[model samples]
Target: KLLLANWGLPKAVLEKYHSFGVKKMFEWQAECLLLGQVLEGKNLVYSAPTSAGKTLVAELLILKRVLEMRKKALFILPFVSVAKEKKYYLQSLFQEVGIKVDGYMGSTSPSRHFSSLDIAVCTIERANGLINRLIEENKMDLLGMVVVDELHMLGDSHRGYLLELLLTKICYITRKSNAVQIVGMSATLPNLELVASWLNAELYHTDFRPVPLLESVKVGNSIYDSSMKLVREDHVVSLCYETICDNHSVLLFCPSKKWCEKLADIIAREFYNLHEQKELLEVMDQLRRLPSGLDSVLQKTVPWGVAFHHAGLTFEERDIIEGAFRQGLIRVLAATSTLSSGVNLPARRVIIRTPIFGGRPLDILTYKQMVGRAGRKGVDTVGESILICKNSEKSKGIALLQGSLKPVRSCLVTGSMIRAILEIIVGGVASTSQDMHTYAACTFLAASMGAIEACVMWLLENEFIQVYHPTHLGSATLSSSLSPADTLDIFADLQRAMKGFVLENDLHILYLVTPMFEDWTTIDWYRFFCLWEKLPTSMKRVAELVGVEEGFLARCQHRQMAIHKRFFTSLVLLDLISEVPLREINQKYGCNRGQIQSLQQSAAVYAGMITVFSNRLGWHNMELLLSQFQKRLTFG
Candidate 1:
């Protein structure tokens, strides 16, 4: 009651929420907004249980700081889907008021200022790209409030270093006047004090949830509640079937895409056979609308009220599944374990199919994150969470479920710090290595120079660091946003391949391409094979030198190739560099439009990297080949 009054919730807006049954704000919202003085430009580092009202906290502050206070506020989400969802949601809220919010993407309107919009909702990479641009152009004094959602993702291995590095760089601009107020929210971070101290912000911690959750275990035909009460006993399919008959939807979090698809395949067959009632036929009508670009499995399964979700599906299809689930058209969604997109879904129940990871049980932190979507206050009486354990591993799954969550430790163990450091130096933001070290020490990943002692000096000591274009390598690194090791690897392979570039022996060009992209994950192997077929038979002589294993090209059938032995050469990329439409690529190789576009970007960058060596060697012919390849790769 007091929160609405204090936070200045408009009466009409309050009524709209009340129409939706949002009677009042939760305590975390009240405590953080009212008591924590979150709007007074004091930085906030808040740790709360899942469903603890962090979203409301962020939205409320965004309205005040950006809409009313007449300054820009930003939401930076680590997860892409969450950013997309919140972007749509915040725009809805803004359209309600006279406020304007811009959903920012790096590709949209470069060399632009964000002051034109009230709030910008963007992913970390997008925001980082813009911020680096602003710093480059010297207009870094723009934002007033920045909310870093899932601040606990600082421990994430794949993208954590980039997040921390961006944070450290943003701190440089914000610390000058203590200018920007930060709102850091996390559900899994345990080390609150250190993070709070590191951010120089007020720390708020809460263990309360509006709708309490109960954890249970399911083994074969038996389902037990948190209190060990055997509530149901039937086959797994029977239990799921009976629950859908009860009109309550469920979400199953599986460990792998194959199994997620496996269960979805079985359950959806039942759905396709049943649910022919009037209500479901209406759903079928909706499914028949805009059915293009859908593969065979989705067309068969999604219409039957079962949806399988993973990264392999495009954003358009995932949006379709998510929207259907919201409207109760789709009753079940089978998702892989990487569902950390700030999912606002609250089904009647959430099930973890396999609670095992890497020979050990899944961490309690991960389990909690998955099950948190089961309940929300004013939504369900109590959220039901279950772990599906095999008969032999029931006790083990239960123990893992009840285990304490792992601490939120720093993943400051990456070598990408060198990339960020090089960025600042090349951009003329920092000159001396000593000054770079000082700025590096300010990062969360920075403990001491002793940690990456070798890596610290690796960049500065190299001759590549001396003769390199001030704007060349740095812009490439930042533009691709690849790992320092990746950029370095590109340079390493280019150095090896450049030795023979002046001659007619063009085989070294292919030799240099594959290892350069050390960590690229989005290779369309089918497309790789299609490109392989275009290669001259004589090119096979250099396959061993270029890192292709024996019989790799000879042994490929769709999904049966040794992809690690695959080479991503300029020739293959050039094969892609044609006047063929993106839709053609999608139809020909079963590559989605998204995958085809991704390959285009990588091809452009890899071609540019090759040109870097050509220019360095002052070889006109090699440079000309690189230009033709780069131009055809993109403009084609």
Candidate 2:
């Protein structure tokens, strides 16, 4: 089918897809869409192999609901980068129809209007906050559809519970009537029937891969196919050398950032004859134009048509690297596994250096996600994945090559369960003990009701909830998206600063606003002692006001502690707000540009969050001060 007019879509959508170079629909995609009766507002949950055109179906469903029902839709993505990427993409697709699209990153302001936006692309947390407010304001009816990308994230322990909670709320709300349609898709979800049953969704599963993938293993210089038959005698770099010679790109997966950069350098050495062509020159020019100018490592490696990508690079650097690779300007890209997660760049061949990390074999999910990046649709006829193995680990490597994706499991813990209950109570969705249990029944953890009651008991005992209503602290924690424990820590910090807060400088408030639970900061003891001794009385008093002392700093230097680490991060933020260049901060702190940049960005978001927390708790003066500091962090 050429996306015919009879497909139940507006002319604008059909034309938009055609104009974007997608004229024909794969039979599997068309069948999946029509089989689920998705155009009629049925909830859908589908699983398919990677790069099988899953997103197009979800896009069509969002467009149908928005155009027909005259209601808004939310497209929830997992990361800010992806959300931003999709926001611009959807904006172009919706522009001809006069539909509005926007990205919800984060905000400190209490009031926001989503009425004007037909499609709101949001991160998970922002989407959750938007729903909480909408429910509080009784504006849930504004939404007609919600599309969750990467549905298997429900099993991610760090943040999966939020996605599960979000979906549960929607299912609970739509129990009686089809107020909103839900469409979710993932490449690796194994328990399709159970999840679909929970959502009351039509289930669709397929092994359809748009481009066939070839799996092989390499030992020494000999390559063996999945059948353990001889495939080739060439090796990683030599094999990578052959791919580019045929005018195709390569993605080499490394274990860490250090290895990523090192391999890029090694690969570049093979292309010594590569000169500064126009394409390479343009890429280097783009890197130079970024705020953080051309990276020294990239400056050295890119001329030979090789580049490295990892979390340590600035956003601008990563964006340029991805663009160049996608455009085929960079012949080979060596990257960590972070590049493989939902990033659209793919290559003709993917080379996995080692299947072991920290002396343990890579998990099945991680292995598949990496290998799946091979072969971009409409770009390559076929994809290939080569796993390098030692003779001792060849069996393990072959088993990994043939392994299936792990099944998704629930990530709900006691803390997350408590937060879910408080959010329900705070949103006024449940108010009685029976009402709370009813809501609990809607979760993926319904079978674990014993722990749920214990969570409720702890909440009631600690005064977070009385019976089923949220207390002041409970509401604040939910509203600010802070962990319950972190909320108490922040509350005590603010309570102490309320009476005799330092007014001479921004250090005290900056220290107060530093993320209370950031565990990634590493303190340099010698540098800290030097900064401590050099501090004037005016600045040292702010530290004293917060119960920080020289002796405690020394003790923390001997070991590891979060308080001192937080203080050290505050010092980094102080330098950032003081107009110190990021390059200087990187050298002074001995941290990567991306990590320092993240500290600034995350701290600013938390500053906004803390402002919301303080305002909700009726600490007027503290809220006012925090909001002002938040603006400084924002504009600085």
Candidate 3:
């Protein structure tokens, strides 16, 4: 029997679904239903455009799991913020049927109640961690169905491995207990077929948009000349202003955060003057009042009917501003890329403020995701997406937006992760090298590499290599199996050797290594100063005096020597230093207070590299000691 039948949803339920705020199901939704019927109890992949009602299909699948299979469902989203919003929407829908839903995101406290929910909405990171804990507790087979949203993020290295591992582990556990189904959804991915094959699922791809999109180019205050094929910033802004003047809300997407702020300031200035013209002042005033946080400078520069949105603003500020925009209280919004994703907001016009290839060009998926924000059903006849460009540019913005969609690329998982996984498997964390290799091969990285022979070989060459055998094992594995105290002692020695080498070279390297080290709190800074003092006479005095106690100096050196040290370490020393500029230290750790404190503390520990440098090379200027330090500090 079909799942919908058990949920009291017959063929008639489809016709009556419109009462739940769904006016009509798109053709893609209907096709998905058909696919779901045929592919019951199997993995499935759905790739469609953003805002194309992909969530509706997920809801249907969740309903099937709950009603027909009498099992729980897990829904995973990429970002916690987006997941929280979706959770609310899902909760509202479930409420209509008197069923409650459970949501786990960053904001929520951790819970162990995995079997309580009919449907669980969670961010991918949170869900992966939960699955890992469940696996450790030997209770991983509790799930019946899993829905992965924005499945393209499987390309992420750190998070992707976790996702892939969770999937493979779930598959293994389910086979040992009971069968479970999986559903993956994506909108912007170009390699749908390959991704489907990787997931061991059938692919369903769609290019249909419910509302037609009209692409255009704008420059300054005027629209680009379609016949002459010329457009500038002035022309684009003019056209956008005029469009907003016609009561249509515009969503302007800018590439950089700086540009979004600049554009918002320009629009406010333009709109203010528009209000002074004949009889439009009243309407312009109302629009100007809609946007909050307008400073005196912005108020004077702004034309009156525009606002800005980006991550730079607080959530309360963004929500209030968005509320006003949605209610048509504002005419135009200059926003950074935040609005390009799963947000439900729609606009009649989307003006892209950047046309030049600024940094690296965003991937095709990102471009399409931004363009999809334009056009809303039941709002406008046609949605227009205008790419604003300068006149000097050879290719216009419209051309860039409409160019060929590139294939989605996969990002590999490397660095410590490879070492950590190998150590886990070959050293009895798992059973064998084949077990480790198979687990990694299920990852997006292994799928991208298409093989793991080279990675395995590389791991073997390094001491990181371990082979799992019932009897024969290295001391490292044997050490890992020791008591807690013994294990701590072994790891502590390893950490000390690493830190000692680092401190023997240069203290500045600490800036990069501190985040990786476990014993960061115990780092010695006096050793850093001792090394720094070996540079030159000018650097020596400056380094020695920094943070040196007057009492210690009095006891170690005479009063005259202590006085000289104090004079050099003072702010006045900044002027005397010729070879080692004070700006170097300022640039390294001056901006952040925490970094400054950490650097200063580490420098006071002169026990490590200070002793090494003093014993090896006599103190010299940038010509000798500086060059030597730079050479030695190249690696870590």
Candidate 4:
């Protein structure tokens, strides 16, 4: 047996793991730790198949280093949900060992005494914020380790730039004689050498799966090997029936939200006899209690131990469904493929209805992620990934299974470069052009040097920066997590409000806090008009002041006009802060529960930013008013 004692871990830590029944390590986990010099303070970049125990390797090194070095560690994750979950898990894991753990996600402030904690689990932006604060306070030496989960997110279009910037700064610090160890782990990134080289990390790669995955193609009841040849009743339903009757859960991955519900309904109808299970009604009760109420389709399917999950579903509803499935109370879960990357629900079998989504073939990375949900390490000893495809699509299915994972690339496009450069300049890590080049020397992308120069010039011209120093506008943008363009737009809006001073109601302030991004939610013209007719004079005045016109709204209903997007969103927020039920808001506003909640969350963050933007510009009166509104928006 591979023993924990062989690793020379602290006695309490070893015993704590043993109490959790983790008395032995997998061969690959041990090898990855030892060969990577993880305990010797070397930076580590590792890629293993999903559910291959990657976190354990990183956790062991983190605990050992924090204990021995008497310094703190930062465990950074790409998703907020995962970070919060990991925070609690680590808190319990280290409870008896006397180490403190804190989790920071959306809307939550960072710990005031961050350097005093043993570990801080954070989403990418929060972790980056922490690092920036530490560097400003000259307390970065308090960190002994930084563990980056989902390392491949460095290539994400929306948030990857922050991850890259954080790493680039840390790597620069290491080169400047700091000794903070960096550990990066991902499940599907293929080109590890490049990332490892940039981090100066020991690269560890493995294809081991703790619970073996059996992957195949299905052609109407026959399963074919990955080599090809062979593979349902409603073929998908038959697959679910087989797994469900075996008393094991099946995760049915659909390409769209509609298909997920339709398939769940089908499976529910076919498996109606299994409804006698006692746990089914308990799960139904839980769903019915959620503020969004039981979804109409879920009303039918959940009673029969089936449920659907997608972004359209509210967070509480999704959480219940996921929890029920994990408890084996729900035997079949039909979900959009998007759920794979966001949540950590695993099943005994994964049924992929198609190898294509929205008419496009699944890339190797997406395919890997979908299939990775098949295995739960402690629950399922043998996991299966069954792809249902036509005879004509057999080769495509096999190709997906055998294809290599894609290389993780830099997300620094032209637009993102401006924000990245702004961040570097504002952080004071890079002031002059030469400093900029040195700071960017570790990025995955090349030839960005020319782009950096152009971006700095643009920032200076716009007065966001002056001779490599951040102006008040620049500092406000970074602190509030707004972009340079968005900052300028918001600044202009605030300047108008300050001069006019809309003291009648909060409508004016709410409108200003609304994000400037285009709203993809379709408007219901009838509802829009009805809501408009009910608005008071003060609200109408705010709308008019902000350039929103009733005539424009009428025209937008018939054709298209972008100006009213923010006004409409503000109207929704007004209803939200007024204690309108989310279900009522969803019906009246023509948006889903999840989307409405998303808007509320974004508005809260934006409102906070607007408050800071005002304060930084020395608009004392504007900042004072906005500060009150920010609190109300966040609490609402």
**Highest lDDT: which candidate?**
2
TM-score of each: 0.76, 0.92, 0.64, 0.90
> For candidate 1, lDDT tens digit of each residue in 540-630?
5565444465455445442223233335534434346445544455665554444444555455555555565446345576676656645
The list of candidate 2 runs beyond 4 A from truth reads 1-6, 36-38, 106-112, 270-276, 284-295, 447-449, 556-560
Give the alpha carbon lDDT tens digit for every residue of 1-636 in model 2: 645565776688778777877756666677667774666777888775557666877877787778789788888887766677787788777876678887785443324466777787778887887888787677777778888988887886576678888888877766723668888887755577788777767887878787878888888867788887996633566677678778877788888888788778876776675532678688767767777784577788775657788877776677667777656567787777777674767788888778785478987878887887777667779888887777678778989988786777776736767677777677777777776677778777664336766777777666676645656887777778666767667776777787798777899889877776455545567777866778777888888777676666666331224455567777778887889877777886776666876776678777777888876778777777777777797655
Evaluate all candidate structures by whole-model CA lDDT and list the values in order. Answer: 0.62, 0.74, 0.54, 0.73
Best-to-worst lDDT order? 2, 4, 1, 3
Deviation in angstroms for 458 in model 2? 1.5
Candidate 4 — worst ten consecutive residues by lDDT sum? 554-563
Weakest 10 consecutive residues of candidate 3 by summed lDDT: 509-518
Residue 7, model 1: Cα distance from true site in angstroms: 2.8
What would the per-residue lDDT of candidate 3 be over residues 394-483, giving only the tens digit for each residue? 364545655665555554434424433543344344556566565665544445643355655544554434344322222243222221
Residue 619 error, candidate 1, Å? 12
